[PDB]
Design a binder for this molecule. Structure first.
Ligand SMILES: [Cl-]
Length: 79
């Protein structure tokens, strides 16, 4: 399983979108849920973030979906 942001083996790229959502706020929440977080990048309509293929994330109030595609990034991905 490989990352769409970095090409890394061992990742699934999710997109994240929510009200009053930013990237640091995204990451804090994810860690707040016990998830291990890889590369992140903000995109034109939201955020991309790598989660473990095994991870089954459930943040209250946020919508988290695996990406089919990566489009309209706003920044280069990094950790
Ligand atoms: Cl499942």
């Amino acid at each position: 399983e490989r990352s769409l942001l970095t090409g890394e083996e061992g990742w699934r790229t999710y997109k994240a979108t929510g009200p009053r959502l930013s990237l640091p706020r995204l990451v804090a929440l994810l860690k707040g849920q016990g998830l291990e977080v890889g590369a992140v990048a903000e995109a034109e309509g939201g955020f991309y973030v790598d989660l473990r293929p095994e991870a089954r994330p459930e943040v209250a109030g946020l919508r988290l979906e695996p990406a089919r595609r990566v489009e309209g990034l706003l920044e280069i991905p990094s950790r």
